[PDB]
From a paper:
The human AAA+ ATPase p97, also known as valosin-containing protein, a potential target for cancer therapeutics, plays a vital role in the clearing of misfolded proteins. p97 dysfunction is also known to play a crucial role in several neurodegenerative disorders, such as MultiSystem Proteinopathy 1 (MSP-1) and Familial Amyotrophic Lateral Sclerosis (ALS). pmcp97 is a member of the classic clade of AAA+ ATPases and is an essential cellular enzyme. p97 is composed of six protomers forming a homo-hexamer with an N-terminal domain (NTD) and two tandem ATPase domains D1 and D2 (1). p97 is an essential protein in regulating cellular homeostasis from membrane fusion, Endoplasmic Reticulum-Associated Degradation, Mitochondrial-Associated Degradation (MAD), Chromatin-Associated Degradation to NF-κB activation (2). Critical functions for p97 include the translocation and restructuring of proteins from large cellular structures such as organelle membranes and extraction of ubiquitinated client proteins to facilitate their degradation through the ubiquitin-proteasome system. Here, we present cryo-EM structural analyses of four disease mutants p97R155H, p97R191Q, p97A232E, p97D592N, as well as p97E470D, implicated in resistance to the drug CB-5083, a potent p97 inhibitor.
D592 is located in the pore loop region of the hexamer at the inter-protomer interface, indicating that interactions distal to the D1-D2 interface can also influence the coupling between these domains.
Numbering used by the authors:
A (entry chain D): 21 to 707, 728 to 775
B (entry chain E): 260 to 707, 728 to 775
């Protein structure tokens, strides 16, 4: 038994002496809330930390940060021994000194700038011989214990004096640098990063297991994403956290060699990593190495591609090397590389969402000190087209602005800077706004994927439609047991038709938010570009991106916008079928029905929609969104007024009754006009900060009905023709 | 390995990775080495990457390698007993000079295995490990209908890796070698396979899949007149050809199906392939339209070639008029009723071998816009009209559609058929689909019973929509009577 062995895993808190344990873990080992333990690992070394309460990690695993993982020489997946230590122990004299690998540039006091704001009111239990890292001064510097009283009996106390000599010491090869790349340095990538964690955990941490079994290990991992997403960061972090010898192979570095030298350089890079097993061979750019799809210009290019292909599939076990290649675009790769044995496991790393970029900002700003009025929530929202490298550049530029506001008048003309100035240099929002306005996003044209923040509370009315949407996309994904028993497959998608500006997009986004799945949206111009551009082959890429991002919903806005541009029911001498809808149907028919992917079709002119899409099998479920009723319009305003401060004066119920033929869009622009009037009257009166009732009274003058009465009749007759519930309404069984 | 011949593997990129002139020596030395060890088999991994001399023609070394391969290929004037077997991905991606008589004449096409084929692959790849009692490979093959042989091996490996992850974490056998008393007890369950099945991306989705469909005559409701006619033109010449050559007249080349949509135009074609035990190739409307909108009509030849060497097989064209509907119809634009895709289809059908067992099935729902040039005796002369199901034809439809979902004796199927007068085959399917969806919804809602009750169909019958109205019924009937034209000669008799 020996219930003291726990699985080491990454922590969540950014502190130093923190251990995250579940309630039953301390309840089994008679451990309390505010106690200390003694973690013991390999190489005859121990560590003293503080246990904390957790409820998310696991049942029998320990969450330990990178700062303390390097102290015990224990990586992820290894096992350690934990035991309580209720013995009283105080600190008297702690002597520490940093290592010269990171102190080059520090001048002045070292206690007041790094130790005082870290050791006081913390009661961090230090251990003689441990390496702890502290952050501050827009950098990261650690410290090393060289001589102290024999451990245990080392706990920082307010009445403990600290003195240091001043010169640093050199480190050894036993410990790794804390400034390197780790799992805690990656943000905005959780679904993709977890797959890579679980994919290479066995062959790297346990190389001897695969040598004794017939299981084929994954020999190739291809990474996607626009340049700057962080593929190299993830590749280096996996190697640095799994104990594998990382070997970086740059793209242009090999191609820059002469004729025949590139072959030797690429070939010598494989056995070198094979000897240092386990190892990870990473390729920076692979589209620039083997673009053997359309280029095929030059014998040396093909020779390099063939050499790479030969060295790729020729890894018949031997060592335990895993090759992870990175590229920019999936189609820009040689198809011969995707053969089974060279590159079979495929990983797509997308642009982080709003909740992902905040983690990147927290990672990139953890070394510097910010002011109280600095919030990263608005920065992530305002930066919705940027990538991982974009935000690091934004942070660097924002940090540079603060230096410019103090270097000019202080004029520290010294060979090295002091640590007592940079700590006080707090970056404010004004520094970030200057850099945000000039940073050009590198990721704007390709489709962005989210899991939208809009929920059911933002949608007013449409209660009949909500239950229907929560009936076909949430039941097969949560309770499939009642589906395979009957032997019938679920629906492939549902089409939305009705008057424009009623919520055709809000329902699709809310159903994605509730189901916790990705959301891909295609607008009208996006569909029209591939028609006018005479290139309909881009549907396959959209469907592939949706498939491997499962679960996800495939939303097509105004699907009839391609038939409206060429007439409609009659139009020109052609019919109601074109190349883009052709390719969409072709890719939907061959789409995997067992996957969690879903397709949402939105249209405002259902009379011109091709019937070929509407058969049972592609899009059979049709839900009509009518105009909001009296109590449906009230909820629209109750949901739209949650952002702007409006007092109790405005009567929303009375406004809904007068707005009879008003769609959802009109009620939004009414509030927009009222708030614009409020802003205008505030600015004009500045030469008050609340929305009054006469604002809406004047804004109601220009209340234009976007939907007239002529199309209402057409929509209603179309709905009743497609429903056809008459005749069989009184159909009953005799006995 | 089973014939006792010395196998010599020649990789594609391995030869191309050599320098200028070294690849020639490496390829040449690989022939006499196998010749001395006769008998031997010389296998080429990738041949499209060695001799793509069809459009590439870039570089003197590439052409030199192709010419060296061609010279060493046809230069094997007996001598040894070596047989060269080359492998490639796509038939058109090969140099036509290699297909000359003497180098590569025998041609083998290996297709994607069907449902009954993938089960054997799973049994082969799982015979070394131990599975649990609740592990069945029948559903895995059905759920994996776009995967290939290597895909299923990868799926099995990934499923086996999941089981190890659930035990290595807590056991922690930190040893240089594993013990045999642990892996035997590590039984892989269905939960391990389902995780790997959901993330495995099939590599074979766009090219046409070939089967020998599992649907039989018991699944088709009614249409007894049509079954005997189908079993009359495709099963007699293939089983009893002795009475065909004696009369000196060739059998028919194909039969066209016309009628209202959703009546069984595909079920009959699949059942006639199942009964005859032959391959089935299906082409949908969008597949035909892609080669029209893409301005590339040359892909008909590949489809016909794939059908020919997969004999016996049936060539099924779904909604053949879907290409005329996209451009108008009877009048449409300033053009007529003939386009490039139908042009190529006719060109390849006229030159098709009449002695082969291949067959062509044409399906259409707007026969008025079908080009008469296809309809002459010689290409598509047999026409069979599928009318709306009658009273006793609709009962069998439900009796065949209810074989999958558990339904008690309560629901009266005979009474439902009489009220559904103007209902096609498709409407009766969606009625049952709605009823079963209601049953699933009421089971899930009541969970917070496992049988289909009678009020399920009673409520599902409210939204019974007739996909075929009355206006097109008259047009279909008048078209059928115009094409039949059996009047006038009904009382034609011989005097003596
Ligand atoms: N998801 C991320 N989390 C944290 N930092 C990131 C992320 N993505 C990129 N970065 C930062 O951007 C910098 C540049 O990354 P880069 O080398 O361009 O990645 P790639 O090679 O994948 O394009 C790195 O120093 C890294 O710190
Ligand atoms: N039912 C509704 N409840 C609340 N707001 C709505 C509703 N329908 C539309 N809106 C508002 O109208 C705006 C534009 O909607 P739009 O995308 O044009 O709808 P649709 O996709 O149906 O045309 C959205 O920002 C949304 O906030
Ligand atoms: N005669 C029939 N008997 C039983 N089921 C039928 C019949 N006709 C059609 N169906 C059902 O309708 C569904 C769709 O048929 P479909 O392919 O649209 O027919 P068609 O090719 O004639 O248009 C099929 O899944 C099939 O089960």
């Amino acid at each position: 038994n020996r219930p003291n062995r726990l699985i080491v895993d990454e922590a969540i808190n950014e502190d130093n002496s923190v251990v995250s344990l579940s309630q039953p873990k301390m309840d089994e080992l008679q451990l309390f809330r505010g106690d200390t333990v003694l973690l013991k690992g390999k190489k005859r070394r121990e560590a003293v930390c503080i246990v904390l309460s957790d409820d998310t990690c696991s049942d029998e695993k320990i969450r330990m940060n990178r700062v303390v993982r390097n102290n015990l020489r224990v990586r992820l997946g290894d096992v350690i021994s934990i035991q309580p230590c209720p013995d009283v122990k105080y600190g008297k004299r702690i002597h520490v000194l940093p290592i010269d690998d990171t102190v080059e540039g520090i001048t002045g006091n070292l206690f007041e700038v790094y130790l005082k704001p870290y050791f006081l009111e913390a009661y961090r239990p230090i251990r003689k011989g441990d390496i702890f890292l502290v952050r501050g001064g827009m950098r990261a510097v650690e410290f090393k214990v060289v001589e102290t009283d024999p451990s245990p009996y080392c706990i920082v106390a307010p009445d403990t004096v600290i003195h240091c000599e001043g010169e640093p010491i050199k480190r050894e090869d036993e410990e790794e640098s804390l400034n390197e790349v780790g799992y805690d340095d990656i943000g905005g990538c959780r679904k993709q990063l977890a797959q890579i964690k679980e994919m290479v955990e066995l062959p790297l941490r346990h190389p001897a297991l695969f040598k004794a079994i017939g299981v084929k290990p994954p020999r190739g991992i291809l990474l996607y994403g626009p340049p700057g997403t962080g593929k190299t960061l993830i590749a280096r972090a996996v190697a640095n956290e799994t104990g594998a010898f990382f070997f970086l192979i740059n793209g242009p570095e090999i191609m820059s060699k002469l004729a025949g030298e590139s072959e030797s350089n690429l070939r010598k890079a494989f056995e070198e990593a094979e000897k240092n097993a386990p190892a990870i061979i990473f390729i920076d750019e692979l589209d620039a190495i083997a673009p053997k799809r359309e280029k095929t210009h030059g014998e040396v290019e093909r020779r390099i591609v063939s050499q790479l292909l030969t060295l790729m599939d020729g890894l018949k076990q031997r060592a335990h090397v895993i090759v992870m290649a990175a590229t920019n675009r999936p189609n820009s790769i040689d198809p011969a590389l995707r053969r089974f044995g060279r590159f079979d496991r495929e990983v797509d790393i997308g642009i982080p969402d709003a909740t992902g970029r905040l983690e990147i900002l927290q990672i990139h700003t953890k070394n510097m000190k910010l002011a109280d009025d600095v919030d990263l929530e608005q920065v992530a929202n305002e930066t919705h087209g940027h990538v991982g490298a974009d935000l690091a550049a934004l942070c660097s530029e924002a940090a540079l602005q603060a230096i410019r506001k103090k270097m000019d008048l202080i004029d520290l003309e010294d060979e090295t800077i002091d640590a007592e100035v940079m700590n006080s240099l707090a970056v404010t929002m004004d520094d970030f706004r200057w850099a945000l306005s000039q940073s050009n996003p590198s990721a704007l044209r390709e489709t962005v994927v989210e899991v939208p923040q809009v929920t059911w509370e933002d949608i007013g009315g449409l209660e009949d439609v909500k239950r229907e949407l929560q009936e076909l996309v949430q039941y097969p994904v949560e309770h499939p047991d009642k589906f395979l028993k009957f032997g019938m497959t679920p629906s492939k998608g549902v089409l939305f038709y009705g008057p424009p500006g009623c919520g055709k997009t809000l329902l699709a986004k809310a159903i994605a938010n509730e189901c916790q799945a990705n959301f891909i949206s295609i607008k009208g111009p996006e569909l029209l570009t591939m028609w006018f551009g005479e290139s309909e082959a881009n549907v396959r890429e959209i469907f592939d991106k949706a498939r491997q991002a499962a679960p996800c919903v495939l939303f097509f806005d105004e699907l009839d916008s391609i038939a409206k541009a060429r007439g409609g029911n009659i139009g020109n001498g052609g019919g109601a079928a074109d190349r883009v809808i052709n390719q969409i149907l072709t890719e939907m028919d061959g789409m995997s029905t067992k996957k969690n992917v879903f397709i949402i079709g939105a249209t405002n002119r259902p009379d011109i929609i091709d019937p070929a899409i509407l058969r049972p099998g592609r899009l059979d479920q049709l839900i009509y969104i009518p105009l909001p009723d009296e109590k449906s319009r009230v909820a629209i305003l109750k949901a739209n007024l949650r952002k702007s401060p409006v007092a109790k004066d405005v009567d929303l119920e009375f406004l809904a009754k007068m707005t009879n033929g008003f769609s959802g869009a009109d009620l939004t622009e009414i509030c927009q006009r009222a708030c614009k009037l409020a802003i205008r009257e505030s600015i004009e009166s500045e030469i008050v900060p609340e929305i009054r009732r006469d604002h809406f009274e004047e804004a109601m003058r220009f209340a234009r009905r976007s939907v007239s009465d002529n199309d209402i009749r057409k929509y209603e007759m179309f709905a009743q023709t497609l429903q056809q519930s008459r005749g069989f309404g009184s159909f009953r069984f005799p006995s």
